[model samples]
Target chain A: SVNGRLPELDFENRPSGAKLGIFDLPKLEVSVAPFTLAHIRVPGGVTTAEDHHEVREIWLVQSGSGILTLDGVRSRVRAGDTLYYESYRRHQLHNDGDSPVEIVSIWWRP
Target chain B: AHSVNGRLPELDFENRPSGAKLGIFDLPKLEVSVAPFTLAHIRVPGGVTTAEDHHEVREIWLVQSGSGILTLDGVRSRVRAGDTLYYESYRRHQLHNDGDSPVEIVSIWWRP
Candidate 1:
C-alpha cells in the first residue's frame, strides 16, 4: 500500500499553501528519474490555481467533491474521479464541499 | 464525475502465469486529457495463482475485495480487504487466491 511510506499533513507538519501542500512520496532519489505519489487535502473553499511547465501530474479524488479546472475547461469531480494534467496547462482544484477534499496526486517526469 | 469511464469489456487482459487476468486502463490518455500512470485491475479466480514477474515501475495496490496470499520478493503475506500492496521495482511477486471468493485488485503504477 505504500501508505505507510507516505506522511500525513497533521497540524504540526501542515503546509503553508497549496504549492507546498503537494507532498512527494517514494522520494526523488529512489529512482533514476523522479516520480511521486502524494496525498493532498484542499480545505473547503480553497482553490489552487497553479501552473506547471515541465511536469506531468495526475490526481485521484479520495473524498469530498470539487471542480477541476484544466487548461481552460472545467469539470465536476468527486470521490474516485481521476484528473490528468500536462505541463503549462494551468490547473486548479476547487473544494466546494463544507469539508475538505482529499486527493491522491501522482507526478512524474517524462 | 460523469466523465469517469473505464470499460472492462473493452479492455483486454493479458495472460499471466497462474491463470489470473490483468487489465489495464489508460485513464489519463483515454478519458481525460493526459498523464503517465495507469490503472490496472487484476482478477484472480479462487484457487488460482498469477505468474511471477517484476518490472522497473513502482506499483501501489489496493485490495478492492476478496482475500489472498501475496508473494512479494520471495516473502508471502496474507492480504485481504482494505489491505495495501506495494510492489517495488525488480521484485518478484505473485498472487494466490486461497479463499473461495475471487480476488480482485485495483492498482496504479508509474512509468518512466
Candidate 2:
C-alpha cells in the first residue's frame, strides 16, 4: 500500500482568508481535506455569509445550536445532526443559541 | 477555503427510503469506499463488494453489540462487542454475524 497518510494540509499553511475574523481554534486541518475538511465554531450571535466551494462537503454539528441554509432551504442542526452538500452551492451558518457551534465538515470531490 | 453548506444536498430522511436499517442512522457517519459492513440495530442483508478490488475505503468501527468475522487477504479474525477494528483502504473484507441479536458499531472513515 502506497497510501500517504500524513498531514498534507496544516493550519500554519492555510492561505490567509479575508482576515475578517480570528479563530479561537483554527477550523482547517490536513486530515479534513484533500479529503477537504473544514470546521467552524460559532459563538452565540455569530453569523457567516453565504459561500460556496469547489469540493463536496458534509458537516455535523458537534455542539451548540444553529441554523444552516442550503440553496434556499434552512434547518436547525444541533449535536448529532449531519447534513450533506454538493460543490459550489450557497449556504451559511448562524448561531443564536446560548452555547457555541462546533461543526465537523468533511470535504470530497464529487 | 470555501464554505460547505452552500453546495452539498442535505440528506432527506423522508424523501429517501431508509437504506439498511443496520444502525447506520444512529452512528453519525461511516463510509468504506463502497465496502459492505454491518449496522448494529439489525443484521444487514447485503454484502459489500467494490468495482476495483485493490482500492478500498477505510473506517474503524467499534463493535457495540454483536459478534462477527473479519476476513482480509485470506486471514479471518473473530470480532465481537467492545472490540475496535482498524480497517485499511486496500484490504478486502467479509464480515459475518454469528450472534443472534442485532449489531451496532461506531464507524469513522478516512477523510483525505
- Which structure among the candidates has the greatest lDDT? 1
Error of 2 at A61 (Å): 0.9
Task: For residue B90, give model 1's deviation from the true position in Å.
Answer: 1.0
Model 2 reproduced share of reference interface contacts: 0.12
Question: Candidate 1's residue-wise lDDT over A2-94, tens digit each?
Answer: 223234323344366434333235544475546788899999999976656567777777899987776667777787666666655677778
Q: Interface root-mean-square deviation for each candidate?
A: 13.9, 13.1
lDDT of 2 at A82: 71
Q: Itemize residue pairs with steric clashes in candidate 1.
A: A1-B84, A1-B85, A52-A88, B18-B49, B18-B51
Question: Global lDDT for candidate 2?
Answer: 0.59
DockQ of each: 0.02, 0.07
**Cα displacement (Å) at residue B48, model 2:** 49
Docking quality class, candidate 1: incorrect
